[PDB]
From a paper:
The T=3 icosahedral calicivirus capsid is composed of 180 copies of VP1 with a molecular weight of ~58 kDa, which is divided into the N-terminus (N), the shell (S) and the C-terminal protruding (P) domain (1–5).
As evidence that this is truly [name] without activating ligands, the inset in Fig. 4A shows the absence of density where GCDCA would be located. The density of the outermost loops (mauve arrow) is disordered, and for these regions, the unsharpened reconstructions were used to better place the main chain atoms. In the apo wt structure, the environment of V339 is markedly hydrophobic and tightly packed. The overall CC for the [name] apo P domains of the A and C subunits are 0.69 and 0.67, respectively.
Numbering used by the authors:
A (entry chain C): 27 to 530
B (entry chain B): 15 to 530
C (entry chain A): 18 to 532
Write the structure that this text describes.
């Protein structure tokens, strides 16, 4: 334990008068150093001084045992003990500084000159034993609330003096560092409350479903494969299948997978002595509601591709030659306009080459897709020719990383090509529903996933799932590569955005 | 002391697992004054402002009979004293009185809920996980409980509400009676409280009457000397009737207890069934004289379609309304005159009327083509023919914002109506046309001007005769602005209009009223 | 008799001592003491100037200060190396009255968490208070205790503490026939009390709160117009011009929030970057359509602004020069002149809010050009008017509010520039006014200033002599006001320097300017 210019901090002695209870923790927990989340770093000889190696806030989330225990309590108090472990031999050089930042220091960028003005310790990369530090509870309140995130003391480690070493011709040398912690003797909980299952210290989990038994987020068809291809555009701007990890739906994505590529509208039929019968649809919500224009490109579930598709609705005939018929229309979304389709304004048109008088009843219909002709993976004309609010394009990606896609095949009417079409998505609808319902709390930037075989257990690849809702693989090949669709995705831990993945 | 004690008496079994909590000793070095409370206040238990509740056989386990937030609002003395301070701190003592008949059986649980616990769905499983006490409904002596200031600050703020310990009572076992005769008893429980030794206030401030706690009060006026909120006439009767529709959707006379007005109800009683407009006239060889009214706000402001189905004070009933219009002509011989017009606002007939632009059309049969000038007019009602108690058309088959229908009520609960009569045009009948409202315009003005703060869900009121000083019945005034009472008879019931309504206490929606 | 009750007793405020570092020590990391001689001197507060006028009415608030390190320049300077503070202070008040003036004021100690509505003359005396006469010759002092529910305060936020509020108890009256323009000046000073210290020693950060606002040391001649790419020529006021224009460019907040469509650099004004497409089929003419993007290359998405950054906000006809490449060989990239309409005009739908622009150029042959990115900058203006153009077809777009809300007798200070216009009969030059010039929209959003009050008092001086030209109020919205009751426009020399004095409230009265 190093000497730092700081006073002792009182824990339960300050909180006892105004606390209903003071609860004790298992004494076996005070004897083990456990790995802290986001408490690891690697120093390379190509780093410049001033990089923040780690930044961790005091609280129950540092220890998994305390994070589990906090679900049955109302408050907490006390200090912690922290250990830093460095992996370097006797032929290295470089220095590191670990400082104690007070709870209310402003957030921003620090400088190596400024980091030494805090109570701090300076450590050489040749140190043998782990470095022990205290983490004290500097506060203006008597105790903290477990279900609320407040400001506490921070531990910040920054590179101070650059690493100087020799390296072999195959692999480059790095200095690894890890941080562990445990509660100090002065640490307590406050009030015994019934346990809560949805707490802020809850880890993200994924449904146990094979991708072959999932649904596609852009076209209503089962998923037929997952793959990766650097030749396709690396920054697509799809409006469907976008969802945040915390449970925020981005763009025009609906909760249910049946709303995909379909729209609900009220249809007015006008027979013209020229082209023929024309149906004009005024759009409404799929579940049934008034469409209020806002910051969305189109009503939820609207298709987000450019092409020629047909729709079928339920029609009632007023005259007496029949009583109920099912017809088929044709909607044009090609780069020709000439009909002024404005989904944002809440109106669209379609027509058929049908003779005679076929006036019908305007009583609201649901239009489902039938097929596509000349499909293009480009967003449609949400307005006349002008700009509309829409979700940002997928990205950014680190160098050497490429998006992983779930591909599926739709129908065709086109004559030229005869093999197949292909539409891709970033996540199946099951994941969208899972994230929307669970409403997790994101920690830093992204999650480390793991695709493993169901029965053999062999690891296939490791990827990164960003909070914006895309998966990136570290692939440095040339041609497209597909993967088996029988594995299960597993969550490992939270990782920083600048994290290097293992190559395929 | 008492007659046969085949009951529980003292429930001295608590041993509540909680530590003593420091009160005003921690806040003394942080205040700039020395304050204290009258020592005599510390010496007797007084009824809480929300200290009445009922347990009935129709209740089910898991229902919340009451919940109390720690603070000055549990004591009338402390609630009155809090108007001249910022800051309070300390513990309190509570006495629960529930001593039902010896033929009854049941169990309740009272728990200490700490601050920051989420509010809403509390189940019978979780309530026993808190420090709690088990009570039989037959207990003879009062049950004494502590309420402690568990907190992470030095003191609280009297204005605006913070997080404090709660006292929640849940029905653990359904109430049943062993008596053979025809009925099941109802338990009437009471709450009393007094501050503990180390309770204090912090800093003396000017005494402002309109504070958060206060207490709701009603104007001291007999119902017969009040004006109706749906027709410009004095209130003539106080009635209850189960034969009439039970969930009306009246637009006028609707107000919230906290002050907010709902619908098209105006502040003044002269705006009822009257409207101001810009009036233009035309003559056509068909229908004759056609008058068009562009409706505007009666204070001169323009009418903009918003969250209201119509301008304030618009007639919400249906039928044919005959009104009077003052007109000025340019013809030589006379200058000013008053004409009588008729309008049809009943069922939709062959007419082109759209309240979206605020246009109202009146037709008159005439032989001579009168020439007039478009101007400004205000129309008040004169007669009603073919009256119907239903809302008129506002957008010709399209939904418009409206106040929700009055309700809901407990089983056996029926709405109380204030009844007035109008001048009616009749052909071969003689029955006087009658209309009903929920609250008179005096109460609407009182609520809109005072802007009270509601506490739980409703207010308990008692109607007392002034001539003899006799309480006639008790009723529940809901926060949405309607009064309900328990009645099971078939025929209509009438009450004298010489009484005075009095506020008793705050009650929840599950409170059971006595039969009338 | 037995006891004597004096009729004249000196005023005093009774208090109960409040603990400072004694309460905060067990939970604070450190307790740092300050220089022992800072406790010995009253120093003017950063917000320490106010005025009383006969126009004021009883019940009006003259000032209200909050306890903390922002009342003393030494404490405000020292707070840049600490994260917290605790303790009490003392405040001094001086009034520059006369013998012809009658009036009374009350200074009260309002505690934290008292509702911030409106106080009356009856309620103000229910607080601990001191009653002061405007004819007093000596300063009046009061204490300021740290009444709180926490252990200490955080420097970097305002939080809630004890207030010091002063209101006009009795109307100000002068026995003179009047009305004249007599104004009573009031000044505030403060110092720490025996119990006051800081909490945690941190590196000195210069860009913190309680850092006093400064201005660049640049004469108005050496600045740039914020509404036209030309140097600022004149500085003037004019009461015959509209009081509250709706300019969209050249607007900035004191705290650094860019309001409207104003860019950071001065090279973006009245210029735009867009992807161009040219067409000419039978009778439409050589029409170029532009899909707008940001000048730095980023994509444009409709948001809370009515146009991209730097878009013109004046109505007229614009003539611009665009770098265009022609596909025909033997003639490489040139500059083409294009005429475009800014205001409403039929046969077209100008909607810059939606990223669509239409321009036309006279032609008699093919003159074909290739598509791509282009940047258009102004060349000439015809039919200039100071009205916002048609940002949409028939819809309302978000806009900055009109300037307002000047006190009676206050006009708007304007920076005047002359543009390049095309005329046929009138030979008069075209003039355009701005509220704040360029490098004044900059220097904000670069310094994250905290306003701490309602207005800034500035003094305009001469660099070589020091003669005071005028005093003015810089409101937080980013504009200046001057007290002037004349009819004709009045200009000022443009070779001066703007100097900050202090922070003043809304009701501060400026000395009238004139000759």
């Amino acid at each position: 334990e190093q000497a730092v210019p700081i006073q002792p901090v009182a824990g339960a002695a300050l909180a006892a008068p105004a606390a209903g209870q003071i609860n004790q923790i298992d004494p076996w927990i005070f004897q083990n150093f456990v790995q802290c989340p986001l408490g690891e770093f690697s120093i390379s000889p190509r780093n410049t001084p001033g990089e923040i190696l780690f930044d961790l806030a005091l609280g129950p989330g540092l220890n998994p045992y305390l994070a589990h225990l906090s679900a049955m309590y109302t408050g907490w108090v006390g200090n912690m003990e922290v250990q830093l472990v460095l992996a370097g031999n006797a032929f290295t050089a470089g220095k590191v500084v670990v400082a104690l930042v007070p709870p209310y220091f402003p957030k921003g960028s620090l400088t190596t000159a400024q980091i030494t003005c805090f109570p701090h310790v300076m450590c050489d990369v040749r140190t043998l034993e782990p470095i022990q530090l205290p983490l004290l509870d500097v506060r203006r309140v008597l105790w903290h609330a477990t279900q609320d995130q407040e400001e506490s003391m921070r531990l910040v480690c920054m590179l101070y003096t650059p690493l100087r070493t020799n390296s072999p011709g195959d692999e480059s040398f790095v200095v690894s560092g890890r941080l562990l912690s445990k509660p100090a003797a002065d640490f307590n909980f406050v009030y015994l409350t019934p346990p809560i299952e949805r707490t802020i210290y809850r880890m993200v989990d994924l449904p146990v479903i094979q991708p072959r038994l999932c649904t596609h987020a852009r076209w209503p068809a089962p998923v037929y494969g997952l793959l990766v291809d650097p030749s396709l555009p690396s920054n697509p701007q799809w409006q469907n299948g976008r969802v945040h990890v915390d449970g925020t739906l981005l763009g025009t994505t609906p909760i249910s997978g049946s709303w995909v590529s379909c729209f609900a509208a009220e249809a007015a039929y006008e027979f013209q002595s020229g082209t023929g019968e024309v149906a004009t649809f005024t759009l409404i919500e799929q579940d049934g509601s008034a469409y209020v224009p806002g910051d969305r490109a189109a009503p939820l579930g609207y298709p987000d591709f450019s092409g020629q598709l047909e729709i079928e609705i339920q029609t009632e005939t007023t005259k007496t030659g029949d009583k109920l018929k099912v017809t088929t229309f044709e909607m044009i979304l090609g780069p020709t306009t000439n009909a002024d389709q404005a989904p944002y304004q809440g109106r669209v048109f379609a027509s058929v080459t049908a003779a005679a008088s076929l006036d019908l009843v305007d009583g609201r219909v649901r239009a489902v897709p039938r097929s596509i002709y000349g499909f293009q993976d480009t967003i449609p004309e949400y307005n006349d020719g002008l700009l509309v609010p829409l979700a940002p394009p997928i990205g950014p990606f680190l160098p050497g990383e490429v998006l992983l896609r779930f591909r599926t095949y739709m129908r065709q009417i086109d004559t030229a090509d005869a093999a197949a079409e292909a539409i891709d998505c970033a996540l199946p609808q099951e994941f969208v529903s899972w994230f929307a319902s669970n409403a997790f709390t994101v920690q830093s930037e992204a999650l480390l996933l793991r695709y493993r075989n169901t029965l053999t257990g062999q690891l296939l690849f490791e990827c990164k799932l960003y909070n914006e809702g895309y998966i990136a693989l570290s692939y440095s090949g040339s041609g497209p590569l597909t993967f088996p669709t029988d594995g299960i995705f597993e969550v490992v831990s939270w990782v920083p955005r600048l994290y290097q993945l293992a190559s395929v």
